[PDB]
């Protein structure tokens, strides 16, 4: 305890996306680094750009090692995402805050028994409006998805006025909300 790192329940992989229209969407996805301790998470987070500082068209994705940050993945293709839609004023006040909070929910395993239904999370930096989302494995699991959304919304500290949607990746890859919270 004087010398051992604090282990996480999962190894996590951080990915970076930069739009290059000459490439397949997937080839623009590049692995930054993986980590499986609290200490190693902070070493990585502390040296990388804040989302509010990325060029428009970039993503960060944090996913459980073995799960690619794409809807094609075995663990994603039945799932969906809880989506936070930002306007341009929230990039200033909310984006970086909201995103750190999202990582802490992933790494600290904040959703009880349904944290196992979490695949990862992504932040989209966009000129038109930023987005943050948590991806879950099965859009059918009403209790899992529904529990994650409730706790996520609490964790982001969003008021009863704000309502957020969950969209299945099946619908997206074709968007209606299966659930809102």
């Amino acid at each position: 305890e004087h010398y051992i790192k604090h282990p996480l329940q999962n190894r996590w992989a951080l990915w970076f996306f930069k739009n290059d229209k000459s490439k397949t969407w997937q080839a623009n996805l590049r692995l930054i680094s993986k980590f499986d301790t609290v200490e190693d998470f902070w070493a990585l987070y502390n040296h990388i750009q804040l989302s509010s500082n990325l060029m428009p068209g970039c993503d960060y994705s944090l996913f459980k090692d073995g799960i690619e940050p794409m809807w094609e993945d075995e663990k994603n293709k039945r799932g969906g995402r809880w989506l936070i839609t930002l306007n341009k004023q929230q990039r200033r006040s909310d984006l970086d805050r909201f995103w750190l909070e999202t990582l802490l929910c992933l790494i600290g395993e904040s959703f009880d028994d349904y944290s196992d239904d979490v695949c990862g999370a992504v932040v989209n930096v966009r000129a038109k409006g930023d987005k943050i989302a948590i991806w879950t494995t099965e859009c059918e699991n009403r209790e899992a998805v529904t529990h994650i959304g409730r706790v996520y919304k609490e964790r982001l500290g969003l008021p009863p006025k704000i309502v957020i949607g969950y969209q299945s990746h099946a619908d997206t890859a074709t968007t209606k909300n299966r659930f809102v919270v």
Partner: peptide, 14 residues
């Protein structure tokens, strides 16, 4: 199950 509080994780940042 390994679970960390928000408060513990923030206390680790530096």
């Amino acid at each position: 199950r390994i679970i960390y509080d928000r408060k513990f994780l923030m206390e680790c940042r530096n």
